Amino acid sequence: MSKGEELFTGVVPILVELDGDVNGHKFSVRGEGEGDATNGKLTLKFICTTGKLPVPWPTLVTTLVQCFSRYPDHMKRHDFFKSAMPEGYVQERTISFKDDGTYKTRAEVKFEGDTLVNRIELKGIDFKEDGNILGHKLEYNLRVSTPRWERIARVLVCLLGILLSLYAFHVEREHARDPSYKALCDVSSSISCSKVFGSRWGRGFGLLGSIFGNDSALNQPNSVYGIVFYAFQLLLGMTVSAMAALILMTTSIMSVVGSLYLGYILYFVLKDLCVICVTTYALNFILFVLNYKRLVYLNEAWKQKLKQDNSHNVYITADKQKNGIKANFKIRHNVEDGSVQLADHYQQNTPIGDGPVLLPDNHYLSTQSVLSKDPNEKRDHMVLLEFVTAAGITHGMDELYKSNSLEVLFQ
Numbered sequence: 001m002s003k004g005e006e007l008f009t010g011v012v013p014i015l016v017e018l019d020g021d022v023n024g025h026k027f028s029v030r031g032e033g034e035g036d037a038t039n040g041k042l043t044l045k046f047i048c049t050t051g052k053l054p055v056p057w058p059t060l061v062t063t064l065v066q067c068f069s070r071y072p073d074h075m076k077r078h079d080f081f082k083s084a085m086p087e088g089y090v091q092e093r094t095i096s097f098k099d100d101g102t103y104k105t106r107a108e109v110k111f112e113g114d115t116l117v118n119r120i121e122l123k124g125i126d127f128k129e130d131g132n133i134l135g136h137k138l139e140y141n142l143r144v145s146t147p148r149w150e151r152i153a154r155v156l157v158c159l160l161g162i163l164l165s166l167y168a169f170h171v172e173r174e175h176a177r178d179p180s181y182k183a184l185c186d187v188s189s190s191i192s193c194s195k196v197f198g199s200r201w202g203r204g205f206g207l208l209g210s211i212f213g214n215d216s217a218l219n220q221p222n223s224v225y226g227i228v229f230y231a232f233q234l235l236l237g238m239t240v241s242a243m244a245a246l247i248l249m250t251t252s253i254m255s256v257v258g259s260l261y262l263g264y265i266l267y268f269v270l271k272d273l274c275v276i277c278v279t280t281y282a283l284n285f286i287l288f289v290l291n292y293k294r295l296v297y298l299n300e301a302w303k304q305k306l307k308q309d310n311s312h313n314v315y316i317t318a319d320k321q322k323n324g325i326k327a328n329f330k331i332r333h334n335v336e337d338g339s340v341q342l343a344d345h346y347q348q349n350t351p352i353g354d355g356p357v358l359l360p361d362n363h364y365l366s367t368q369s370v371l372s373k374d375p376n377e378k379r380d381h382m383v384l385l386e387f388v389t390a391a392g393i394t395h396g397m398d399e400l401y402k403s404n405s406l407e408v409l410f411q
Contacts, residue, residue, distance in 0.1 A: 001077045001358055004085030008037035008067065013115045014044060016064055022124030023101070023134065025054040031064060033384075035116065037082070040070030042386035047379045055124065056138040057382040058333055061369055062345060063093065063105050065118050066314075069365050069388040078360030079390070080316075080325045080349065086111035087353025089324070098342040101127030110352060132333070132341045139334045142369040144310045145240040146294065152410045154290050158234035161283045165226030168276050172197045172221050194274035196222075201265055205258060222262075226280060229255060233287055241338060245298055248291045255284040311366045314345070315408055318359040324350035325360065330411055362404050363392035 016031035033044035046057075046064060053060075067081035081089065088110025095103040107120040127134050175181050176197035185193035200206045204219035212218050229251060236244050259281040266274055301308065314329040327347040332340045351357045370385040392404030400406070 001079070002083035002356065004067075005076070005079065005082040007085055007111065008035075008082055010038075011036050012068070014042070014065065014068075014118070015112075015115050016044065016046065016118045016120070018060070018064060018120040018122060020055075020120075020122035020124070022054050022103075022122075023127050023129075026050070027054060029053075029060065029064065031384075035065065035068035037068045037070060040068065040388045042068055042384065042388070044384045044386070045374060045377075045381065046384065047377065047381040049379075051380070053380050055133055056136055056140075056333075058138055058140065058142055058371065059097075059103075059133060059343070060382075061142060061371070061384065062095070062331065062343075063103065063107070063120055063122060064384070065109055065116060066365060066388065067109065067116070068386075069390055071390045075363060075390050075393055077358055078363055078393070080358050080360055081109075083356070083358040084349075084351040084353070087351065087355065089349050089351050091347065091349045093348075094346045096344040096346075097127075097131075097133060098344070099128075100131045100133055100341070101125055108352065132335050137336050138341060139336060141334070141371050142310065142312070142331070143308070143334065144312075144332075145334060147297070147309055148311075148410075150290055150293060151237075154237045154287070155234060155410070157283050157286050157290070158230045158237070161230035161280060161287075162227055162234075164276055164280055164283075165223045165230060168197070168226065168280075169221065169223035171276075172202060172223060176202075191275050194276060195270060195272045196262070196266065196274055196277060199270065201262060201270070205262060206265070230283075242298065245291070245295050248287075249295060252284070252288040252291045256288050259284045309368075311368045313364040313366055313407055313411065314347075315362070315364045315404065315411070316360060317362045319348065319350075320359060322348070322350050323357060323359075324348060329364075361393060362408075363390060364404055364407060365389070366391050 012035050014031070014033050014035050016029070018029040020027050020029070028049045029046050030049050031044050031046035033042065035042045042065070067085060069081070071079040088108060091107045091109060093103070093105045095105070101124055103122060103124050105120060105122045107118055109116070109118050111117070132138055171192050175192060196202055201222070203209060203221050205222055209216070209219040233248060233251065236248055262277060263281055266272065266277060312329065312331060314327050316325050316327045319326045325348070329345050331343040331345065333343060335341050366389050368387040372383040372385070374381060374383050391402055392407065394403070
């Protein structure tokens with residue numbers, strides 16, 4: 001929609017000019033290149049014209065032109081950025097670096113003749129002298145350490161496991177000893193009904209009692225081990241380390257052998273059915289497969305660089321009171337020593353001119369960046385290849401996990 005879109009049917013030259021001040025350090029960045037909105041492709045080179053850069057280049061990527069995003073024709077009536085052209089738009093951001101300082105940025109994005117120009121003023125405040133930013137301790141990339149689907153699958157499986165363990169604990173404590181529980185399970189099929197709760201295997205899995213004192217603290221009902229195991233798996237899956245991966249693998253192998261044991265008991269030596277038990281066995285198997293996939297990825301991702309995702313979603317909503325849009329998103333910068341530096345982006349865009357702009361339904365941009373160097377360039381510089389495509393809106397269920405309403409929850 002809109003006339004402005006007709007301006008992006010071919011290759012458009014790009015100029016970017018940034019003046020910045022971070023903790024009093026002043027600097028200038030100049031960038032040139034070209035953009036292809038039909039492919040959602042940006043090809044740019046930036047040089048610091050004032051000597052060395054005081055902040056890491058990856059922290060400047062989001063500041064240094066979303067009108068080159070590829071909008072599928074279905075989503076074309078949701079493209080605010082092209083509809084504001086050629087008069088363009090003002091883009092303002094606040095970027096909070098966790099446990100560190102803040103960027104405030106204001107930019108005008110507009111056409112000057114043939115060139116799309118992005119003119120930026122940036123101020124950084126309250127940055128630590130030995131933090132990850134002024135310390136230059138961020139990796140030179142914008143990658144995603146673990147694939148996004150594995151992260152969401154892991155959190156979902158662990159959350160369900162914690163809830164099922166809590167429910168099993170509740171049933172053990174407040175239901176399993178009543179005689180009406182027996183009477184009603186003998187005549188009704190319920191998810192709460194199982195013969196293992198009030199059984200030898202309900203505490204410590206049947207073993208590890210009489211291997212320990214059998215009244216010890218280490219011999220707990222199985223739901224306690226469940227809560228502990230799933231919470232531990234979640235909290236350590238947050239971390240991406242070889243150590244963490246080994247520990248998760250070992251615990252998952254223990255969980256699968258324990259599930260085989262208790263399932264053998266369930267089918268043969270305590271003939272019944274326990275829906276809660278079978279569900280947790282399926283969850284343990286899934287976590288096992290996810291931990292194995294994480295180790296395989298850790299070892300073979302270098303080969304599989306050629307097909308890594310590495311996309312970051314920027315969530316856009318309409319802002320009718322200002323005739324513009326707002327957006328939020330989080331960038332996780334990887335730190336050399338293995339930790340992560342979080343950057344919370346808050347963004348608003350308002351049109352510069354007076355013309356019909358498109359106010360969108362909620363959606364997101366999926367953005368992939370490749371950062372490199374020019375070996376001919378002696379100045380402090382960054383080469384940037386960007387791929388940006390809009391998503392989040394379809395009619396069909398087969399790609400429902402792509403919808404904005406589900407993606408927003410996992411960021």
